RNA sequence: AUUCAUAAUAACUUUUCGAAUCGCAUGGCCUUGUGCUGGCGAUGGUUCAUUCAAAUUUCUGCCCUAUCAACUUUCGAUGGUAGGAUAGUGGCCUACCAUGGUUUCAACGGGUAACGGGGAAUAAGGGUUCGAUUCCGGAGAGGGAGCCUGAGAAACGGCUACC
RNA sequence: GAAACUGCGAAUGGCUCAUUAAAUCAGUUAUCGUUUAUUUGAUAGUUCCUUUACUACAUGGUAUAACUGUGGUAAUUCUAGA
């Protein structure tokens, strides 16, 4: 009312953040940025919450104004930033990198990946438009726009973006039997192959998905993420692959490992 | 102030509303401007967003495109002479949208003479070439060609005065300007 | 009635009293920026020319300029008005002014010199009052020394002396909009930076032509057979 | 799915923007000088996209009452055309025109000790009752109205008037 | 580093349930019907007085706050003249 808000209470954050009820009766409001504050990981939750570098966001803000973090190669000392996914943050210290997947119980799972992946990172095409001056340009899923793209990038591809500037270095088609990755819905996480898919016009093209195991299931278009071919995907798997093995096996899992 | 909400009106079956809310910044209207001839006069107002409008006031040239020849001149207004909306704003000679204006008909004269040389109405071989290849092309149109004697040119405006602030128009012709004479223009 | 006197070419000032009220009647029904004769307002004005600057009138409302009345009313005043000083963005509020029109009524009449008189007086023309601090901005400073155009500034700053008991100290103002290398580098730094992004555009839009060039021959060429 | 994105032509404009801003470092090349050339930033700045939004909007769904059966329409009610206004669609308003629109499948009017919802108590099944109140949405700041500044308010720990 | 100018925020939050019965609201739609500070990405070699006025870009000038003083008012986060 009167203009937008800049408090987010807690038990209206997004699910999976999986933040604890008590202890606090706000959360972090993730500012605008390149990713929807409801599919976003805010750098203070990653940091705190996931990995325990901080004990408060005291000691969160202690570290980023020190420049030590920083996200898709830029520093951005914003406490609330909201990276998203397939983004990539690096720490200077610790000598790590890690890049935001969700696992197959859709939330954002610490992943840590190598310096030649978080070189790079992968985005979906949103749109295709020819901006001023006649100049093509496509739109991707994180907010970012490149000029001069291949002509035959479509809508709901996917491009690799090499991160050190915003540039096009390949790009997967959208078509069948291709790698997906699910970034939506009730199936976020899953890692599968199209089947097939249902035009439906006007609107929401439905998508036919194929586990690795041979679960098929259904989403809706803007749910699907190409990451690459029948096997060989252009981004490392988060621990899991994305398969949403069943409560039963899960347990049974869960008990061979814990009793030896 | 000026609302335009649809909260006030009555139900589509008839019955009263009762009241919601009180009025809101965005859904505010504002009073016309009522556009009139002669020194030029022109007021800003700040809308939603910042982005500025114009307020034409008392302003008394426009630019007027002739569509058949493909070329806008900035031509002065000499008065409204029909609008299809109000007569007060004819006999108040108000500057609207669709309003039937005479203009002045001599810069069209003027770039008429350049073009083609056809001293429309009552040198060197470098303008002669291109007067000969633009001929065949040099009749119009019998009802502008009278209006061009008159002196002064029938023109609809185009534009919208309270809100870019200009006073912009076309020169009537063909079907549109046989139906404009007809209707009050002649016939007294 | 009190008259606060001000002679400004030396800012000097200086509060006089007059009672025996038959003798301010030189200034009533008269307005802020009309001249005043002083023999008529005492004897020690011979000559003297005071001109309304403002006045404040009994319980202390200004008086305010275009107010053509000699009571006192209500005005919504804005920002950057006398009388009135916004507390915050966009404030509008509604005081009580006195009319610009000289009456009884008022308390003080602030009043300035506009001509020197015959004799001097004990406290305004016989006294000088230097100016705070001289220029900041360096065609101000050139301005005030007059000396040319092509001239260092950073000698002609003015500096005031301050002493501490035991160690005097001076200081002087930081000079504005002084030419400066480092003010050259950020302008060339623009310029070259314009000039950089558009020769990069140039250079990516020639490729993306190149690119379509070679498409269009090939996807075209290759499908003329079938 | 478009008179879309773009792009071109003819002009138009109280002529919008196109860096007279700031901090660290202060290298390279000599034409040897208030010479050339130089990095990392900060703050700005049209426009497009994005994000946080906002406003309008489709369909369906609300408690009791006929001791409420007809209601709406000169003071817009239902449509058309044109204009004005608005950030924008729209009787939102204006001019002219047509006589429409809702209703026993309950309109219209009256009542509510009515803010709506997530939900709560009870509960074989079906149900009954509650939800001012931790989250979401709405509204208001003694009652009304008006407005400034602002991207955003008809703001009230803003202003103006009346009570 | 007081004060003050400039910028930003003060339209969030918190409180209450008076109004409100196709209204709000819920689920579901649309914007090919619009505004959008801020964030993020991209993004201005065209400024020729609205030419036979390129006249400083080694960088144009005005006018003020704070401050120095004279003050008014019983009184307010009132303010005048210099
Ligand atoms: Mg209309
Ligand atoms: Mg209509
Ligand atoms: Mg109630
Ligand atoms: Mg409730
Ligand atoms: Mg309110
Ligand atoms: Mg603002
Ligand atoms: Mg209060
Ligand atoms: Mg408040
Ligand atoms: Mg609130």
């Known amino acids: 009312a009167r203009g937008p808000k800049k408090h987010l209470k807690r038990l209206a954050a997004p699910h999976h953040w999986l933040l604890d009820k008590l202890s606090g009766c706000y959360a972090p409001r993730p500012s605008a940025g390149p990713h929807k504050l409801r599919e976003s990981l805010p750098l203070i939750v990653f940091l705190r919450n996931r990995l325990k570098y901080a004990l408060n966001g005291r000691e969160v803000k202690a570290i980023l104004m020190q420049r030590h973090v920083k996200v898709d190669g830029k520093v951005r000392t914003d406490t609330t930033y909201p990276a998203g996914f397939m983004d990539v943050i690096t720490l200077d210290a610790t000598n790590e990198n890690f890049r935001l997947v969700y696992d197959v119980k859709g939330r954002f799972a610490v992943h840590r990946i190598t310096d030649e992946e978080a070189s790079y990172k992968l985005g979906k095409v949103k749109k295709v438009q020819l901006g001023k001056k006649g100049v093509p340009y496509v739109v991707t899923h994180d907010g970012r726009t490149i000029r001069y793209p291949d002509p035959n990038i479509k809508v709901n591809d996917t491009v690799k973006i090499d991160l050190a500037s915003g540039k096009i270095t390949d790009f997967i088609k959208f078509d069948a039997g291709k790698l997906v990755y699910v970034t939506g819905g009730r199936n976020l996480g899953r890692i599968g192959t199209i089947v097939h898919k249902e035009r439906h016009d006007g609107g929401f093209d439905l998508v036919h998905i194929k586990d690795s195991l041979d679960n098929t299931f259904v989403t809706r278009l803007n749910n699907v993420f190409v990451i690459g071919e029948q096997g060989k995907p252009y981004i490392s798997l988060p621990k899991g692959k994305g398969i949403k093995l069943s409560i039963a096996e899960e347990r049974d899992r869960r008990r061979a490992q814990q009793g030896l | 102030?000026?609302?335009?909400?649809?909260?006030?009106?009555?139900?589509?079956?008839?019955?009263?509303?009762?009241?919601?809310?009180?009025?809101?910044?965005?859904?505010?209207?504002?009073?016309?401007?009522?556009?009139?001839?002669?020194?030029?006069?022109?007021?800003?107002?700040?809308?939603?967003?910042?982005?500025?409008?114009?307020?034409?006031?008392?302003?008394?040239?426009?630019?007027?495109?002739?569509?058949?020849?493909?070329?806008?001149?900035?031509?002065?207004?000499?008065?409204?002479?029909?609008?299809?909306?109000?007569?007060?704003?004819?006999?108040?000679?108000?500057?609207?949208?669709?309003?039937?204006?005479?203009?002045?008909?001599?810069?069209?004269?003027?770039?008429?003479?350049?073009?083609?040389?056809?001293?429309?109405?009552?040198?060197?071989?470098?303008?002669?070439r291109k007067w000969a290849a633009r001929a065949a092309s040099a009749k119009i149109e019998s009802s502008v060609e009278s209006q061009f004697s008159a002196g002064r040119l029938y023109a609809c405006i185009s534009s919208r005065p309270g809100q870019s602030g200009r006073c912009d128009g076309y020169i009537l012709e063909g079907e549109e300007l046989a139906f404009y004479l007809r209707r009050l223009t002649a016939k007294k | 009635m009190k008259l606060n006197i001000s002679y400004p070419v030396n800012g000097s000032q200086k509060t006089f009293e007059i009672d025996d009220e038959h003798r301010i009647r030189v200034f009533f029904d008269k307005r802020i920026g009309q001249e005043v004769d002083g023999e008529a307002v005492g004897d020690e004005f011979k000559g003297y020319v005071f001109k309304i600057s403002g006045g404040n009138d009994k319980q202390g409302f200004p008086m305010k300029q275009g107010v053509l009345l000699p009571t006192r009313i209500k005005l919504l005043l804005t920002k950057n008005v006398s009388c009135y000083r916004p507390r915050r963005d966009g404030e509008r509020k509604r005081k009580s002014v006195r009319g610009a029109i000289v009456g009884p009524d008022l308390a003080v009449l602030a009043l300035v010199i506009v001509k020197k008189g015959e004799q001097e007086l004990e406290g305004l023309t016989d006294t000088t009052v230097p100016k705070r601090l001289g220029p900041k901005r360096a065609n101000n400073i050139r301005k005030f020394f007059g000396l040319s155009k092509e001239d260092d500034v950073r000698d002609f700053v003015i500096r005031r002396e301050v002493t501490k008991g035991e160690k005097t100290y001076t200081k002087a103002p930081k000079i504005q909009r002084l030419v400066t290398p480092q003010r050259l580098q950020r302008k060339r730094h623009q310029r070259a930076l314009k000039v950089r992004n558009a020769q990069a555009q140039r250079e990516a839009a020639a490729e993306y032509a190149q690119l379509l060039a070679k498409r269009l021959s090939e996807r075209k060429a290759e499908k003329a057979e079938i």
């Open chain 2, 1 to 128: 102030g000026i609302s335009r909400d649809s909260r006030h009106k009555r139900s589509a079956t008839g019955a009263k509303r009762a009241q919601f809310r009180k009025k809101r910044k965005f859904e505010l209207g504002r009073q016309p401007a009522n556009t009139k001839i002669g020194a030029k006069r022109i007021h800003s107002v700040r809308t939603r967003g910042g982005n500025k409008k114009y307020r034409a006031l008392r302003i008394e040239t426009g630019n007027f495109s002739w569509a058949s020849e493909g070329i806008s001149k900035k031509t002065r207004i000499a008065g409204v002479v029909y609008h299809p909306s109000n007569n007060e704003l004819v006999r108040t000679n108000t500057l609207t949208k669709a309003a039937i204006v005479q203009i002045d008909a001599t810069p069209f004269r003027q770039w008429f003479e350049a073009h083609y040389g056809q001293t429309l109405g009552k040198k060197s071989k470098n303008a002669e």
